[PDB]
Design a binder for this molecule. Structure first.
Ligand SMILES: CC(=O)N[C@@H]1[C@@H](O[C@@H]2O[C@H](CO)[C@H](O)[C@H](O[C@]3(C(=O)O)C[C@H](O)[C@@H](NC(C)=O)[C@H]([C@H](O)[C@H](O)CO)O3)[C@H]2O)[C@H](O)[C@@H](CO[C@]2(C(=O)O)C[C@H](O)[C@@H](NC(C)=O)[C@H]([C@H](O)[C@H](O)CO)O2)O[C@H]1O
Ligand SMILES: CC(=O)N[C@@H]1[C@@H](O[C@@H]2O[C@H](CO)[C@H](O)[C@H](O[C@]3(C(=O)O)C[C@H](O)[C@@H](NC(C)=O)[C@H]([C@H](O)[C@H](O)CO)O3)[C@H]2O)[C@H](O)[C@@H](CO[C@]2(C(=O)O)C[C@H](O)[C@@H](NC(C)=O)[C@H]([C@H](O)[C@H](O)CO)O2)O[C@H]1O
Ligand SMILES: CC(=O)N[C@@H]1[C@@H](O[C@@H]2O[C@H](CO)[C@H](O)[C@H](O[C@]3(C(=O)O)C[C@H](O)[C@@H](NC(C)=O)[C@H]([C@H](O)[C@H](O)CO)O3)[C@H]2O)[C@H](O)[C@@H](CO[C@]2(C(=O)O)C[C@H](O)[C@@H](NC(C)=O)[C@H]([C@H](O)[C@H](O)CO)O2)O[C@H]1O
Lengths: 357, 340, 367, 42
């Protein structure tokens, strides 16, 4: 018989939690991981008491203002730091006997920040509309806001630039140029400091105030975000689940969770809440959600068992120290490689550059 | 023939109202339903007079404030709440022969919030432009505005996140996280409490200050909206009849009405009116229109007769309370299974 | 063996720094150059010490106001200047045979300004939010902002127009309309002085306040940016490694680096920082990134070999000086040319010319 | 280079070049795994 035929749709295999992963997928098997992160700017979770931690969870603790030009000690919880994490996907392949290997590859993702509604509480004690008779509304969040995020195959690569190099970040309790570069800041960090580059190794540690998505000419993450400065600037958002975003690359690639890592990272400053007290602001951020769509992709093997086995070769000998044959003092005056055969050139050490002439 | 035949367009069958539905559609029969929601934030409809309910209908009552930190108790009409309703559709055809079912599928929807013009009355007693010599214009609405809405085929799933988690909400006469997790708020809720999730079921009850459309892992609703915070932030809005929106899903499905129901939900804060008095503040809302376009779509029964009957029977039959007829004290002494 | 073959992606030969370029590429062979320019407006790098240069690096020093309508001298660090550079590339091949050569052809460029995050440091000593009790936030970067940039196969052709032609710019350390054109500015400069046009011959030198991307009727640079006036005006920026732009031209060309040099040029003001001290309102900028993707393109050689070859070989002859056989007093009263052989004309003193195309028995003298 | 004026312009060569990176491609190799993983030494 001829029955009506419902539209074909992708057939679900299993829904559930992280464990659903372990299910043997197949190859065009598709995965829809759906998580989020709680915005970690300043006050850490831990003290769960709304008295002791006076529950500022998800808020810049206080807003320490430095002393004067030479003295700027922020104070850790005065600091909105980057928030991220790693979805650990299962291993897909065992063919390091053949070249081809398949790995997790992110494609599209839907993200959304939420709680944009909580911005309508207008009672409570904030500087109020009318100071005079102490009336009106507990004046809402306003100010510079900021949101960025990224989905990638290894942690996010950062770069440092900062407002003041004399700023005194407590090296204890937060990454900072120095904590990564030892030596203190320099005016160059006040701009493009190509040295001052780090990774998202940690979390809720790299204050956004310092660290930035460095466009390392090389990248397997997709990040995006925007700065909206201002002292009294009105917040805005997009409460919506309609369209998705493509992590696909220029060649149609998207990230590939190297390791088997799926790296989510973002930040969402909404501006600051200002106490009805003195003028102590202290930013608020909202959590962001993610809906990563990943597939299985074939690639040429990246692992040279040689390395493995040759790890064992440098143990057929010790660590040598000896003069520099690499560095800024390579005493390697020079190297050239030849493979083919050309007829004799005239001056073969031709100044291929025009101005050398 | 000789007489030029004009253009073809869809042939209406019947205009009317919900009743219209019933006539037997067919299978491609498209059904258009216009409707709307009155902005329920603050003062409810009931106090009929503009003397006793000072017809605030369509306005927060007064922005009740707070003691300070240790104390913030909102006040049930200081709270604009999510607004919604459910369109009751009629059951369709089936063909158990092919375990196929027909269900209501929302496609597009033109929605539009009206009353934008109302914001032009600059008289009345709002503080005015020049307060000094009590002169000028009774200051129009300004402030944070919020508009979100959604068209779903089952109630809207939502997550709670609040600003201060102490906020002494009146646990009665409004759903709060406590009203649902049976306990008190936690810092976690203050930023995203995965527990603090719920549904729409009620209405004019779930305050917006609390619940937000949660991107549930899975969803049969299309939602959208935006926040535009600020204290004096100027209102803006869209007057149009011209354009439509598609509820259509990633594979072109849009929502289906689980239960023969279509669900509407939204909120529309335009900001607030401040009274020429103190900084009495209370927000203003606006109502929303909806022209939902839906169709007859074929699906696979994803369930199994047997059991679904069973459920039915079970759901239909009361729970009881029953001397132990199993357990440790089964007043069942024995059982025998004989065949032949 | 037949372990399924992965996707075909373009193969990277080698990467690293400029030298990588050195290596013979081939012809479709592409090159990606990520680089960046630091924002140079006012306080220059040099006083590496945060004491002596008080590390106002990447910052307008302070704001040198003006005496009054009559006297406006702005300091040389109260002057955000166009930031730029040029990349030196290899030389590609020839075929004098077909009189055609290939050149470095820029195509697309991703770019990005970084550090918008920095504008979130709200401690430090800037005018506090609440002046009164001296509380709040050390008030963020606000004010006008400007961002422009370009990319080209030769430096940027610009035009200057200033607010007040009377401004006392220095003859020193900055390129002003004067600096380029001897004669002091006039009201014309103040609006569109077709004279007042320079090049990007320098750097961190022509200040933005003066010099602008002049839409020469002709151009091999692609530029753009925008102004956003104002005093309080909030800064806004764009974080993204997702977008590429097309340096491509209308005929599908993009720039080409004549002089195997690629030229980057840009400017990025976020606005002024303001000392809690007083209203020392000095402005800030951020650095910009660049990712130029250029290929090898074959182009009809412009100027004819011979000419050059022999334009050269003739400029070697001794110089002569001597009487005028050209000019306004040529001692040549005459010149004819013939190739043909018409039969005897009539009027022998007939003239003859060819013009714009056609050759004529000159008008019978008697017009 | 004659008709083209001499700059002076930031360092795009030298010891402090602001050239972060370069790469060249001429081929079509099948999607490599980690394109960037070679000769390991600390
Ligand atoms: C927890 C606490 O009270 N610590 C004291 C510090 O005060 C707090 O400092 C925080 C930043 O470190 C915040 O700015 C606090 O602001 C808030 C907050 O807790 O988040 C803002 C809240 O809105 C507010 N709530 C209410 C209802 O008002 C709370 C509230 O006031 C508190 O929770 C309870 O009252 O406050 C702010 O109160 C104080 O700043 C530190 C000093 O810090 C150091 C430093 O520079 O790191 C510590 C050094 O050891 C000290 N050195 C010496 C020799 O004393 C220096 C030095 O004194 C300073 O440079 C010059 O004064 O200061 O002390 C804590 O006691
Ligand atoms: C009608 C009235 O005034 N009721 C008292 C409450 O005042 C009103 O509270 C509302 C919020 O709950 C609004 O903020 C009211 O503002 C408006 C309004 O009525 O909407 C704003 C209007 O624009 C304004 N009109 C004009 C022209 O200005 C009106 C206007 O004033 C009225 O139309 C005429 O009066 O005002 C605001 O006036 C008052 O807030 C409550 C006290 O609240 C509670 C509390 O929860 O803290 C209520 C508790 O039930 C009560 N507990 C007990 C055991 O009784 C406590 C307790 O009594 C208190 O803490 C100590 O006395 O107070 O009281 C209403 O009577
Ligand atoms: C280094 C210095 O302070 N020089 C004096 C000049 O004052 C400074 O001018 C700078 C621009 O040249 C900046 O605007 C300075 O602002 C800052 C700065 O960054 O240096 C802003 C900082 O916020 C502030 N920092 C703090 C912590 O407060 C600093 C700070 O004061 C210093 O960094 C030291 O702590 O200040 C601003 O203070 C002053 O403007 C110049 C005048 O310069 C000239 C001119 O007009 O160009 C130079 C001419 O050569 C001179 N004429 C002759 C014949 O010599 C004219 C002439 O005297 C003038 O027209 C009549 O007064 O002045 O003088 C320095 O002393």
């Amino acid at each position: 018989k001829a029955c009506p035929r419902p539209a074909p749709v992708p057939k679900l295999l299993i829904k559930g939690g992280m464990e659903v992963l372990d299910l043997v997928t197949g190859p065009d098997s598709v995965t829809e991981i759906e998580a989020f992160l709680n915005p970690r700017m300043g006050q850490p979770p831990t003290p769960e008491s709304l008295t002791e931690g006076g529950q500022y969870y998800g808020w810049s603790r206080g807003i320490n203002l430095a002393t004067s030009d030479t003295e700027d000690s922020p104070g850790n919880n005065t600091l909105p730091t980057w928030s991220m994490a790693k979805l650990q996907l299962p291993m897909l392949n065992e063919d390091l006997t053949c070249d081809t290997l398949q790995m997790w590859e992110a494609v599209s993702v839907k993200t959304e920040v939420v709680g944009s509604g909580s911005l309508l509480d207008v009672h409570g004690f904030n500087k109020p509309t009318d100071t005079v008779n102490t009336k009106g509304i507990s004046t809402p969040v306003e100010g510079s806001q900021y949101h960025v995020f990224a989905v990638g195959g290894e942690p996010l690569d950062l770069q440092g630039l900062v407002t003041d190099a004399r700023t005194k970040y407590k090296e204890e309790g937060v990454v900072t140029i120095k904590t990564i570069t030892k030596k203190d800041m320099v005016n160059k960090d006040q701009v493009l400091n190509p040295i001052s580059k780090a990774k998202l190794d940690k979390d809720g540690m790299y204050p956004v105030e310092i660290w930035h998505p460095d466009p390392a000419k090389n990248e397997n993450t997709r990040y995006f975000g925007n700065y909206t400065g201002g002292t009294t600037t009105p917040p805005v958002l997009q409460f919506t689940n309609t369209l998705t975003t493509v992590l696909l690359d220029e060649n149609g690639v998207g990230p590939l969770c190297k390791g088997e890592g799926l790296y989510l990272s973002c930040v969402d400053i909404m501006g600051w809440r200002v106490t009805r007290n003195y003028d102590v602001h202290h930013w608020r951020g909202l959590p962001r959600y993610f809906k990563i769509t990943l597939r299985k992709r074939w690639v040429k093997n990246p692992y040279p068992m040689a390395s493995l086995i040759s790890s064992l070769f440098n143990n057929m000998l010790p660590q040598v120290q000896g003069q520099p044959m690499e560095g800024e003092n390579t005493q390697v005056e020079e190297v050239r490689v030849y493979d083919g055969t050309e007829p004799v050139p005239g001056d073969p050490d031709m100044t291929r550059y025009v101005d050398r002439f």
